[model samples]
Every structure is written in C-alpha cells, then in structure tokens.
Target chain A: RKFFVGGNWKMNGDKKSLGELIHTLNGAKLSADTEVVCGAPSIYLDFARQKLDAKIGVAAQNCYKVPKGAFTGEISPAMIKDIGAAWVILGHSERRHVFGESDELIGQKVAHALAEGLGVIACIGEKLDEREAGITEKVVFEQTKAIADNVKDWSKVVLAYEPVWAIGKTKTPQQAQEVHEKLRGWLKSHVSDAVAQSTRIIYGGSVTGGNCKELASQHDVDGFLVGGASLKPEFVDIINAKH
Target chain B: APRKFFVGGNWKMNGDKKSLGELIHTLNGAKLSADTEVVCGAPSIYLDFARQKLDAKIGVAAQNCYKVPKGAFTGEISPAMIKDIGAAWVILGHSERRHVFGESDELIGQKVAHALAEGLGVIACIGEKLDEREAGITEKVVFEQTKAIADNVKDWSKVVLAYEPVWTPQQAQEVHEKLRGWLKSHVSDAVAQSTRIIYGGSVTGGNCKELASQHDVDGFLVGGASLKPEFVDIINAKH
Candidate 1:
C-alpha cells in the first residue's frame, strides 16, 4: 500500500485561506510514493475539489447515513459524489464525543458512503477513561468491529486510529505504534491475513511535521490523519516523510 | 410597524448543482412581488452555488449553522463560514433539526444567538410534534420553544419567526395569533407587531394564497414545492 496522508481540516478555513493553501499544494513537489487527501468542511467541498490538483483527492469531513431526505443540515454521500469528492471522513472523535454519534451510526455511514462509491476513512479510537481503565484494546476492537462488519469492500476503506485523549496532546511514535500493531493483529485474527497486510491503517492526533518521520517509520503506522498541521505548508514535509 | 411579507424556501437536504441551477433559472426569470422578502435555504454544500447562480433579488440561506464562528466541530458549519460564503441568512431549529437530529431548545437558542451576533439573518423555527399537538399541549410546547429562541434574540429586525407546526390556514392563524400575543406579553409590543411570523408545513402553491390571506400568517417557509416551478406562484400569492 502507498503511504496515505489524510488531512482532516475539521471546522476550519474559508475560501480565501483554503484557496491559498490549495495554491501552495498545487505548486509544491509532493512525494510520488504517497497518496494525499484533504478532508474539507462540507461547505467548501466543491470549492476545494475545484481548486486542488486532481492528484490530491478531496473528502467531506462527514456525511449523513442515507442518500438524501428532509434531514435538514446534513449532507449525503450522493451530494458528496455529485460534487466530485471521492472520500468521506466518518466517526471522528469530535463526531463521537462532542456530537454524540454512536458506533452503529458510524458503521451505517461507512456502509452508505461506500455503497455510494465514495471511499470511507473510517475512524476509531478509545477515550481517556477507557484507556486508563485498561480497556483500550477492547474499545478499539469493538469500534473497529462496528466499522468492519458494515464494510463490504475493504479496498474502498482506510482505518484511521485517532486516540480521542491524545488529540491535542501529542503521542510518541511508540505509543501510536502499539495501538496500530494491535489493530493490524485484530484485523488478521478477526477478519483475514490479506486484509491485515493490504489495508493501510493510518495514525491520527497531533501528527506534526517535526515528528511525522519517526511516526511514519513505524511498521504498522502506514500514514497519518493529520489535523491542525495539515493546514500548514509544512504538510508537504509530512506527506514526503517516506522520502 | 408593518412586517414585510417574507417567503423562505427550505430546500432541505435535497437537490444537486443541476436541478438547483434549473430552479434558480426559473426563479430569476419569474416576476416576483417586490413587496415580499424572499430567501432560499439551500443545503450547506449548495449555499455558495445557489448564491452565485440565483439573482441578487433572491437571497440564499444555510439550512443550519453551528453556534460558533470556527471550531473543532466536524460535520458542522458555522455562521462565520455562512457569512464568508456571502449567504446572508440561516434557518435555525427546524422540526427535522429538533426531532431527527435531537437538537435541544438550548442548543438551538445558542445557535440563534451566535448566528445573529455574527450578523446573519435568522429564520428561527418553532413548532410542536404530532404527539404534542394531539395531546392538546400544542400552545404550551410552541410557547416554550419560542421563548428559548426569543430570549437569545436582541435584534428583531434581522429575525423572522417561523411557526412550522408538525396544518391548515385556520390552524396556522390560531398558533400565529397566540404566538404574537406571547411575544407581546414576553418580549415587547414592537417585536410582536414588527416581526414577520411565517407558516411552514406542507405549504404548496395551490393553497398558499388562502394561507397568505390569514390575519397573522405573514408568509411561508416552503419545503418540497420550493424546488418546483410553482414556487413562483407561491411567491406571488399576495398579488
């Protein structure tokens, strides 16, 4: 699998600032060995897709479980695909903790997004309490199971392990690797060895340019689901970490 | 103070660039009444597209917005971003937002306050569920919901109170009158008289004129029919 770098811009950037970032990205010489995708706010999904280089894909930060209806304020995967976006970031920590999205809901979203032909960046993570209680593996595995069960085509999905507690606080490469390794083993044991080896399991939470190289060096850490650092120009260095 | 007739079309999680562009074409070509204030609440993805395609006379609004300017809230758009997109309005606390998404009265109130503070026009929605209405607590439910929104609003000028009961013209007038009376007793007489209290809930062009003729039914917040050509007829109901 190629090194994958997914930028979850969260609720940031309007047209002008994002346009500049797009220009920077378009002009910069990125690593050929990596696959880069930016998760844009739903409002700017079209704008980003139009402005960015086609080589660098655009993803909606989130989408509704169904195609379309009177679910006011929500965007559907069909709309995302209609606007030419290829991927969607579902079940992020903010979505789970802040907005009260359940594992079932995330699984349903993953199923719908993939069914609509949009790639799914399915996120799963354990909270601080869950981690402290020594149930990190249990939490992560259950969350992963919810997503895995709903997934029909594993090729169209990327599992993002973003620790909820370690989001703002940085995680050392070792700490990230431990979880990623466990996730891969879970996939191997629970699903199949082919999926475990082929599926690119990326790490998220406080992944900056300074530490991206070491994080990328981890055997299990295939790439990153960067947050704030993704908006900056140094994201090029993070993307080219393999180089 | 006379309230200008306000007609808002909530495209509610529907339409793409092609269909919406065609609807914009029809709206731009139609001769709408100059007396009425019209706004289309497009899905967040299409707000900018609709604003760009639609003529200047017809305003564009975001179907919903978060309470803050910017944040780590994924899957949510803010009022600042809505303003940044050049769309001047937002529809807050719709029934779908309340029932389907589980947006509480407090959350809706915070959203209204923040959207207004950010200088966006608010089409604030208030209504009771079918069960609430059936249980004979419609007024009680609507009043509490209205109070939650009313408490957060400081400027009534940029606000349009939408009464979307989960009805008929007579049923609409009854709720609107009671709401206006509630506003007079609670907020101020100026707000009660000046604010445009519109009706929503299966409003179509066929029945719009009679609904528009109601004593307190200032206008409409159309749903499904808003995407149709007959929306022009509904827009011209007062004529």
Candidate 2:
C-alpha cells in the first residue's frame, strides 16, 4: 500500500512563494510510493492549482461548518471541495490550543467536510503533560472516538495522531511504536477492521527527515503529517521519507 | 424586465495567505444569474486573489480602502495599493467603519476621489442617523452625503450610490425613493440617471422585489441577509 504524507504549510507562503515552492517540489523527482498533498491559502488556489504537477494534490488548510453564508472571513468545505481539491486538514492541536476550537466543533467540521465529499485528515492528539502522566493513549482515544462516534462513513477519513507534548519545540520523537500500536488497535475495534487496515494514522509532532525512518519503522505509523520542515526544500524529502 | 439585481459578498477581514481557489469555487457555483451583477468586496489581505475565481462579468470590490495614495499609515489599506492589486471597486463609508471603528466623510471623500483618479468604481455608502430620521432630517442627511460624493466624484459612471438607511433595511424600504429624487435634483442629469442608487442595511429576500420596483431604487446592498441562501433570490428580485 502507498504511504500517505500530507504537508500543512500553515500560516505562510503567498502566490509567488507558492509558485516557487511548487516548482521546487515538482523538481524533487518524488517517487509515486507516497501520496503527497500540500495546503495553501484559499486565495492562491486559482493561480497555483493548474501549475502544479498531477501527483501533488492541493488542500485548503481549513473550512467552515456551513458551505456558504455571511459568516464573514471564513472558507467553507463546499468551496474547498468545489475548487477541485479532494482533501482537507481539520482539528490540528494548534487549532485546539491556539484558536478555541473544541472537540465538538472539530466533529462538526469533519461532518461538514465528509458531507461535502472531501477527504479528511482529521487530527487527534494529547499534550506533553498528558503523555508524561501516561494518558497519551487515553487522550488520543477520546479525541478519535469523539469524531468517529458521530461520523458514520470512515472511507474518506485519515486520522492524524499528533501529541502536543512532542510538537515543534521538542525534537525527541514520543513513544512512537507504543502510540502507533495503540491507535491502530483502537481503530480496528472503534472504527472498523476494513477502515482500520486502510485508514492512515500518521504522526504529526517532531517529524523531520532525520528521524522519519525510525518513526516510519513503527507498524502503526502509516506516514507523517509534517510541519516546520514543510515550508522548505526538505518537504519533498519528508514526503519521500520512507523511500 | 427583471430588476438589474445587485449582490455583493464581503469577505471581511480574513483569509489564508496561501491561495484563492476556495473563494472562486464558492462564487462560481453560487448560481449567480447573467443579468445580476454579483460583486464581492474582499478584505485587503486577499485582493490579488480576485483573479482566482471571478468571471469577467462578475465584478470584484475592496471591502475598505484608505483615502491616501501611500504612506506611513500602519494597518491601513490604500486606494492606490488596491488599484495595484487590480480591484476596480471599493466599499467605502460603511457602518462598520463609521460605527464600530471611526471613519469620517473627509476620509471617505479622499478615497472616492483617488478611486476616481485611478479609474476605480466607488460604492459610496450613505445613511441617516436614527435620531436624525426621527427628527425628520433623513432627506437632509442623505442629500448632504450624496452632495459630498457628487462633488468629489464628478464622473457618475464609476460610482454606485448605496443608500443604507440607518434603520429598517428590511422594512418598507421607503427612504431610497426620496433620496434618489434628491440626488436627481441636486446632481447633474448624467450623474443622477446613470448613477445606480442601491439600498443596504439588512436587505432580505422577503422585501427585495417591492423595494426593487420603485423607480429610484435600483438594487440592494444586503447585510446579514447577504450571508443567507436567499441572497441569490434577492439578486433576482428585479425579475
């Protein structure tokens, strides 16, 4: 099966930089073994969509609950899906910690994305203290269950397991095998055996090309949902990390 | 003939700096009619994205623009910069600028003139205070505001007069008629007849057709209703 690696170029890049970044990505001779998707500002999609290669898919960083309305300053899933993009990233812990998006709000966003026919990279994870207290499994389990509880179809969902404790500021990869094994086991019973086998449980925090191979070795770590390294030439390396 | 319906979506003050694909898809399939003039006034942050999804017929407008050409004004968007971004229309003098924040007529006039000089169109907002309307200065307030714009923007073709009556945007919609007449009496005939006097301040599908039927009232500048599904219906009210 092909590995799934998605990059969220969060809060950075404009039209020129995006164009340059795409060209830089297209030049990397990335193998088809891993699925590569990049998220950009909703405004630059028109200019960048046609310019990118067929292998690299575009993603809208976020979308609103309702597809259309007067809710000033927000993009909708309908809009994101309609723009020929099939994937979206939702409920990253950054959104949870930074913005005040509750688990319930993310569940609604997931429903909205699925209802609008877009694939989802639904993020779920715990914080440093929670992991230190050995509640990583419990915390991630609850976060995943919250979305899986209401979301009926699991076909389009990709559960990205990110731990707040192991994010950018920390370089040491958290208990990778243990965390991946637990999530994979949880998915089999909680979501479905078929979906469990197929759904990717990519890690998010402290993921870099340097340490990707070891993390990639874990049986449950399907792939990576990258960050800081995503904005540079290393993104391509991260995408083809397994290769 | 259907009313030459006008509907504008304001993207307000937010957008991802990455791309404009989502906004285009949203407006592209909005099922906007050929006869309707669908304009979107996006926040300054995403202006270059105007080209991402809008059709040639469907116009693009800037939500708010600074009056000056360019300068040390921190956290302000200038008309010249807006022009550079390739936007042809500006939504100046709105309640959001005047009520929530504070923007004056002199500032609005400077922006209108700059937009005129740069060949950009203006959707200049005019309204009466609730107390002024209660004290019977509705006509006076509108007339003076219209006078300021007409004096500044000599060319009416590039200017759309938006009558956002301070009260009852979705009510009987009677204020536009008198205001239009006052505009006709004060401004030159070309400026009066060619100028489109649309109404805003909470316009909804429920009362659009009636308000659209009046001779002086051209279309609407919807507020809260502008964010609803019926915004398309209001755009077709003139039919």
Candidate 3:
C-alpha cells in the first residue's frame, strides 16, 4: 500500500485561524485513497479533535522520551496517546537542528510510540551546506538508515526527507524528485527490496500543490510532508496529489 | 506555623508580558491565606519582571538553575543567575530534566546545596514513576530521590519537599495514602522540622482535599491547576 501524505502546521497556527482551517478541511471533498495527518502543538488537540473529520488525525508537536515523571516543560507520547491522538511525528528537522533532538533520542521515541501502537512519521533532512558539498546521498542515507536500522521493521514508519534548504522558503521540484529517487535507492541498498517498495520516502521542504504534482510524478516519491502551506487550503491538494 | 504554606509556581516556559502580568494580578487577587506563601517560578527573562510586578507577598522561582556561579557555560541559566535576578526560590529534580533531558540525582542534590549556599530557597521535587510503583519499588524510588539531596545538606530548613509522585500528580489522591505515610516517616526529623512535604504531579482543586487531609501531606506544587484560577483554591486547599 502506498503511504499517504502528512502536513505539520508546527508552531505557526493560532487558535482562531486553526478553527477555520479545520472547518475547511471538514467540508473539503477529500480522496479516500489518501490518509492525511497533522501534528500541531499540544494546546490545539481538543480543538483539532472537535473540528476534524474521522479521516483526518492529530499529532503532538513534540513529546518527552520518558514514560512519566518530572520532565517538566515536556510532553510525553503517552499523554498524546491518552488524549486519543493516533499518530506521533518523531525527529522533525526543526526539533533536531533547532532544539538539539538527537537521532538516538528520536530512535527511542519511535520505539515507544510504535510499541504503544501509534504510527510515526520519522523525519530526516539534509542541511543546505551538506547538499552543496555533494554529500547529499550519504547524508540522507545516514539520517533515514539510522532510524531504519535502530528501530527494525518499517510497517509504521513514513520516511519524510525534508531537505532543510527547501523548507519554508522555496520550491525545487526536480531536486526534490532527485532526492526522493536517491532515498528510494538508499532503502533498496540498505533494507530488503520488499521493505524498500513498501516504505514511503516522501518529499518535504516547502511542498505545495504547485510543485507536489510534478514531484509526485517521480516513481520513488511517495507523497508530501508539508510545512507552512500545510496550514492553507492548498494542503488538501498536496494530500490528494495531482494524479 | 507550618513553614508558611509554601506554593511555588513553575511557569516552565509558559509565560509572556500580558499573560505574566495577568498571572501576577491573579496571584495577588487570590487572597491566599496568611499562612500560604506563593512563589512565581518563571523563565530567566521573566524573573526580574515577575519580581517588579508581582506583589511583595509572593516569591519568585527559577525552573532549573545550574550549580555553578559563573563560567564558560553559554546559554545555561545558573544558580547565581537566579539569586542575582532577585528571585528567592529554585525548583530542582523536575521529571523533564531527570528523565527526558538526562539529569542525574547527584547533580540535582548539588544544585539544592548550592542554591541554599546562595541563600535561595529550594523546592526539591522527588517522585517515583509508574513502573517503579507497579514493580513495588516505590519506597526505594522515593528514598533514592530524596537521599541524593538530603545527604548533602544538613540544614534542611532551606529546602521544601515537593514530593511529586510521578505515578500520581492531579490523580495522586486515591493511591497516594501509603507513599504519603512513608514519606513523612522517612523525611521527618532529619529534614526541616517544618519543611513542607507538598504533593505535586496531578494535583488539582477537585481532589486536593483528601490528599491535604493526610497527616503527612502539607500542600501542593500544583501543575495544570497552577495555570487556572483554582490554583488559589489548591493553595488554600485547607479551606
């Protein structure tokens, strides 16, 4: 089965605007073939639950690795699960680059969230400098492979390759499809062929309806994990894909 | 009489200008009993502002203060930093730091002792997790959590026992009876004679009564309720 699309509004959306976005989502005609999930901040879960259709799901932006206790100022996957959120996105580039979330730390989160029966969209992205330096393939492989090797089994994992350079600022469809193809090759090189075909190495980084269709035309490109535009009406088109 | 019914609000990256000001007004409006002493724990950026706007009746606390005075530690807030900010309290051994961020108990103890050395009050939180409790390791969990800090500082008066039962929090009441009893039996005499053994974790206005009625339990280090107006109700739970 082909993996569906996920759009993370992240820390950007405010309360009032989110209500309209959810309202639009509820009314919008969505394709049954695609599954859409959004991971927002903890404060918005109740609102998301009330406004979203059953087809759409919610995600906690970040959660503590610990099962319980004094890790004050941190959310736990357990809390997210308890609150009825079915999916948890682990290791976003923002969390890794900006907040010092280590890969091993993300591995643990994947282990726990999956063990708890919650699906995960594990993110791996390359920096601008890394890509420019011609180490794009090595860098991307390491990030994705780290999760693939550590967690073992790929049933619940959606490999989101969000090149940091394209995130939030621009669109580069050819480069994105190229990277997506490379990610599929990396999985083919590292994991079983069956798993490679099954695992979804989707494109992120400034994905919108404008470029998502062209990128989706690539064989290895599974779907999109959108950011800022994910909060917009265009996000549904990105989720539906232009096929 | 009982160490002035201590209440420390660990804002925990949850405040801003208008919000901080409103919180201050709420704390002031609560008319917390004369016995209840409230402390507003906020971010380093907000400490001075909290002191300036918050009433003199309330104290201020910094979440996780480093043990060192001054150093090459860039971006990390220090114990001296809190003291310099004119804040009076420091909260240590938060579950987030211990488990999520990889803080050890020994380090937390050092923080407690040093905070006291600087004359800043301490709210040393100690709690056992669900697995520990389910495995019947509750007593060991509590002792290890406390003994780490108590062994270092002999003058326990400067310290407040925020026994946040990780297994409990707002839902600490029904099952906390045994842990509460064990805590008082083990913590008394050696700790402060009037030191507060405040319950944290899932403490709220709804269930605070039964927990407060326990002989050992003194007050709460309220979490979610701390954000709500009922925090005043939790602080004055004795009422």
Candidate 4:
C-alpha cells in the first residue's frame, strides 16, 4: 500500500483560515508516493472539498451511523459523500472519550460509512489508566475486533492507533512501532494474512513534522493520522515524510 | 414589555444543497412578518451553505455546538466557529440531543453557558418525555432541565427558553405558565416576563395561530412544517 497520511483537523479551522491552508496545499509540491487526506470539521466538509485539489482528498472528522434522519447535530455519510468528501474519521480519541462514543457505536458507524461508499479512518487506542494497567494490547485488540467485525471490505479502511495518553505528549518511535506491529500481528492471527500485510496501521497521537521521519521509518508504521499539525503548512512536510 | 415573537425552524438531520437552496429561495421571496424573529437550524454540514444563501432577514443557526472554542473534540463544531461563519444562533438541548443522542441536562447546561459566553443567541429546548408527562411530573422534569440551563446563564437577554413538551394549546399554555412561574421564583420576575417560551413539538401552520394565541406561548420552534412554504404561514401566524 502507498504510504497514507491523514490530517485530523478535529474541531478546528474556519472558512478563512482553512481556505488559506487549502491554497497553500494546492500550490505545494507534495510527494506523489504518499497518499494524503485531510479531515475537516463537518461544517466545512463541502467548502474544503470545493477548494482543495482533488489529489489531496477531503474527509469529515466524523459522521452519523445512518444516511439521514432526526438525529440532530449529526452529519451523515450520505451528506459527507453528497458534498464530494470521499472519507471520514471514525472513533477518534476525542470522540470516544469526550463525546462518549462506544466501540459498538463506532463499529456501527464504520459499517454504515463503508456501506455508503466512503473511506473509513477507524481509530483505536488505550487510555492512561488502561496503559498503566498493562492492557494496551487487550484494549486495542478488542477495539480492533469491534471495527473489524463490521468491515466487509478492509481496502476502504485505515486503522488509526491514537494513544489517548500521548495526544499532547510524545510517544517514541519504538513505542508507536510496538503497537503498530502488534496490531498487524493481531490482524494476521484473527483475520487473514492478506489483511495483515495490506492494511495501513497509522500512528496518531502527537505526530509532528519534527518526529515524523523517524516514525515513518518504522517498518510497521505505514503512515500517520495527524492532529494539531494538520492545520499548519508543516502538514505538507509530514505528508512527504517518505521522501 | 412584550417579548418579540420568535420562530425557529429546526431542519434536523435533513435536506441537501439542491432542496435546501430551493427552500431558501422560497423563504427569501415570501413576505414575512417583521415583528417576528426567524432563524433556521441547519445541520452543521449545511450551516455555511444556508448562511451564505439565505437572506440576511432570515437568520441562520447551527443545530448544535460544542462547549469550547477549539481542540480535539472531533466531529463537534464550536460556537466560535458558528460566529466565525456569521450564523448568530445555536439550538441546544433539543429532545433528539437529550434522548436520542444521550445528552444529559448537565452537558446541555454547559453547552448553553458556553454558547452564550461565545455571544450567540441560544434556543435552549427543555421538555419532558411521554412517560414523565403521563406520570404528572412534567413540571419536575421540565424545571430540573430548565434549572440546569438557567443556572448557567448569566444574561437572559440572549436566551430564548423553548417549552417543547413531548401539546394541545391548553397543555402547552399550562407548561409554559409553569415554566414562567419557575423562572419568577427561581431566577427573577424580569426573566419570566422577558424570555420567549416557544412551543416546538409538531408545530404546524394549522395549529400555530391557536398555540400562538396562548398567554405564555411566545412563538414556535417548528419541525416538519418549517421545511415547506407553510413555514411562512406559521411565521406570520400572529399577523
């Protein structure tokens, strides 16, 4: 698989700031070998899609499980697709912890988004307490199983390993690779060898331009699911980490 | 002083660019009551679209917003972002948000406080479920919900209390009166008299005038009817 880097803009940026960022990206000489996708906040999905170059794909930071209904305050995968955004980030750490999205709900969201023909960036991670308890693998494995169970096609999904404890803090390249490698092994054992080899497991927590090259050099770390840095011009450098 | 009549159209999780654009065209062309304040709560995805297309007379609102300005809260939009887009209001604590999406009174209150602090008008919705109403504890449930929101609000000027009971004109009037009494006793008499308590559950053009005529029913937070041209009728119910 080509190296994948997804920018989770999270709940940030407006038309003016994002418009300038899109202009910067549109004019930038990004690496063709690395596939880049930016997750814009739901309100700006249409605007981002309209302004950004088609080569750099647009994604909704999140979406509801169904196409459309009385589920107020939610954007559907159909709405995401209708606006020409081709991808969505599901189960981000903030969504799981801050918004109280359950693994079951995230799985349902994955199923529905995929069914709607939108790419899914499925995130999984262990919190500080869980990591302290030394159940990182167990927690991630369970989370991955929930997402994997609903996935009919792995080709459209990118598994994002975002360590909750490390969102603002940094995780060493070795630390991230350990989790990524373990996840690949989990897929190989539980799903199939093809999926294990093909699926891109990206690291998310606190990924920056400074440390991206080292993280990208890890055999198991195929790419990154970026957060804060995504809104800046440095994201262009993170996109070209392979170079 | 009379509270200016307020009408809010909650489009819920519905409509696309083509259809919503047409709706905007209809609203822009229609003759609306100048005395009434009107706002449309578009889905977050279409908020910018609606704000850009809809005429300045018809205000735009976000169906919901997060508590903070910006950060790692994925999928959620902030009031600051809403303000940045020039949408002047946000509808919080809707029944769908409370029951369907599992937003607690405490969370809704925090949202109300934050949205208000961000300088946006709040259409804060409070209602009892069918069971609560049937159990004759509607006042208890509604007051508690209101208290949660009222406790957080520092200024009542930007707040519009929507009594969207889960109503006949009498039923709506009774609850609205009770809510006003709660405000008088708990908050202040000034708040009780000034706040606009709009009815929301299944409000239609046919029922709007009767509901609007009630002593306490200031206006409506309309649902399905808001999507059609009949919304013009509902908006002009008083006229």
- Which candidate achieves the best TM-score against the true structure? 1
| Lowest summed lDDT window (length 10), candidate 1 chain A | A162-171
- lDDT agreement with native, every candidate: 0.88, 0.70, 0.71, 0.87
In terms of docking quality, model 2 is: incorrect
Candidate 1 local lDDT, B160-210, one digit each (tens): 889887637887899899999998999888778888899987888789989
Give the candidates in order of DockQ, highest first: 1, 4, 2, 3
Worst 10 residues of 2 chain A by lDDT: A67-76
In candidate 4, stretches whose alpha carbon ends up further than 4 angstroms from where it belongs are A168-170
| CAPRI category for model 4 | high
What's the TM for chain B in candidate 4? 0.97
Q: Can you give the DockQ of every candidate in the order shown?
A: 0.86, 0.09, 0.08, 0.83
What is the full ranking by lDDT, best candidate first?
A: 1, 4, 3, 2
- Candidate 4, B1-239: lDDT as tens digits: 88999999998888888889999999999899999999999998898889889889889989888888987687888998999889999999998888777899888889999998889999999888878877888878887888899889999999898877663799788888888998899888888889888888888878888988999889989887888889999999987
Give the TM-score of each candidate: 0.98, 0.61, 0.58, 0.96
Q: Which one wins on lDDT?
A: 1
Give candidate 1 regions above 4 Å deviation: A168-170
Clashing pairs in 4: none
lDDT of 1 at B161: 89
lDDT of 1 at B111: 91
Cα TM-score of candidate 1: 0.98
